């Protein structure tokens, strides 16, 4: 029952909500360029006493980096950003609490490794690992780091058959964990362009390792739990604003949060139309409570 | 269909019934670079008895003629003379045939190959030019640099085989080529793992194919076993009559399944991946498909047929 948002309805909701959780890409900005009116509306929400949070499935930037980008583009400051890097670090903290010196093989960014380092998890394998040796015997003979207790698959632009081989070898130990930052098929880019998502890499590792990975990012509930551990979210008085139906809006529906769809990003009203037709009850979960052309549309009520 | 143990008498009955024998290579004829004991003698005897022998492989790393050299070196024999034709059908050659048929009429077909030099050689033989074989290491600081790399014009297919040089760059180029609707996506096999000696394994081609499928939001066409195209690739040259042909294999999900779906008599050899315990599990109907994966006859090794060939 997607309602079209008007200034009157926006005022009504704003009275009801104290916390707003936003996806960054496709909602607040595309690339390094801000959505028209978005910085001012978020500044105004802060002035009206609303608490702002940010949830992202990208593992390439640290919390402080996302916060600096928000500050430079005028969105303000209080941390308020919850990305798959930080939340992956928290997951590994929880699942490796008993390990004395946990080490993880990270097919991912320096930011993911830094976030793991902050929670006490040493990371190995960030960066290039180009193929060496002419056959499987050479590839399977390469020495591995000792005491590796987890394999974390993030956005690895250096992904190679060597990293897949080392990951599978680490995962031959039953105690070893397999964690994926997200399961997205595509990473949205500017101008409607896209590149391969972390989900492709994670699925390669899963298939080779005959394992099912634990997914940290949206639509997984783990990212909401990571936000709630610090915010203490009240589902009834909290709203999730997002651009993608399969990740942001589904997360909102599963966690009983109010949902707003912004049409500045990947998803559009036509997609919601197909979802409103009952092919599956799940697709009904992928429908927003309200829709806005842009987040600046909250400025009339603010 | 009751997985009968092939006794020498039963084996002789089979020899009278079949004129053509199709063998899987790894786990049946040889393990790695070392031959299975007694297999070379058995196949040489089969050639002497006038039986026609063919070979089916899911590995895309060797050309037909190269496989023939390995067979000759290990004592399995070779095509007799000038009239005789090649006996080995691997995923490189049959992938080339698949693109030959599916790119019929294309003026100068080009393919982006995440695969071996052998696959490129076979494609050249069928008239398909190949681009992208070999390493493509990461360059640049961001997506704009990666997406600024120039792509070749008139690429009409993406072929994913065993690529140990697979990289995020090659995946990115593959999706960019596949953004063209006419472009085909072909996979040599969908195996999650490549079996190796001593129970070891490495990641299979299926992982690479799946990554490309997910990013391109496409479904790949698989050439290798259990897909029936490899059987059609054999038949295009052999002209097989299914009831008078036997398929010998080591793996239930690939070799024996191909035999059953193509109405070939099946012999399971226990020198490879599959065991009688696995066929036991399949004989218990957990899945409808598992009934298809049951051998008509079983032997510990193909050398077990040597008494009936003398």
Author numbering:
A (entry chain A): 12 to 89, 96 to 319
B (entry chain B): 11 to 320
Give the text the authors published on this PDB structure.
We had shown earlier that PGP exists in a dynamic equilibrium between homodimers and -tetramers, and that the mutation of Cys297 to Ser (PGPC297S) abolished disulfide-mediated PGP tetramer formation. For subsequent crystallization attempts, we additionally exchanged the catalytically essential Asp34 to Asn, which abolishes PGP activity towards its substrates. Full-length murine PGPD34N/C297S (here referred to as apo-PGP) crystallized in space group P1 with four dimers per asymmetric unit, referred to as AB, CD, EF and GH dimers. While monomers A-F and H are well defined in the electron density maps, large sections of the catalytic core of monomer G display very weak density. An inspection of the PGP catalytic cleft showed that the active site of PGP is organized as a channel, and that Asn34 (corresponding to the Asp34 nucleophile) is centrally buried within this cleft. Coupled to this rotation is a shift of the substrate specificity loop (amino acids 202–215) by up to ~6 Å for corresponding Cα atoms towards the catalytic core. Conversely, the cap domains (Cα atoms of residues 100–237) can be superimposed, which then identifies a movement of the PGP ‘flap’ (amino acids 39–46 of the core domain) by >5 Å towards the catalytic core. Upon rotation of the substrate specificity loop and the flap, channel entrances become obstructed, and access to the active site is blocked. To our knowledge, experimental proof for the existence of open (chains D and E) and closed (chains A-C, F and H) conformations in a C2-capped mammalian phosphatase has not been previously provided.
Phosphoglycolate phosphatase (PGP, also called glycerol 3-phosphate phosphatase or AUM11) is an evolutionarily conserved metabolite damage control enzyme that can dephosphorylate and thereby repair three adventitious glycolytic metabolites: 2-phospho-L-lactate, 4-phosphoerythronate, and 2-phosphoglycolate. PGP belongs to the haloacid dehalogenase (HAD)-type superfamily of phosphatases, a large, widespread and evolutionarily ancient class of hydrolases with emerging roles in human physiology and disease. All HAD phosphatases consist of a catalytic core domain with a Rossmanoid-fold. This core is accessorized with so-called cap domains, which are mobile elements that can shield the entry to the catalytic cleft.
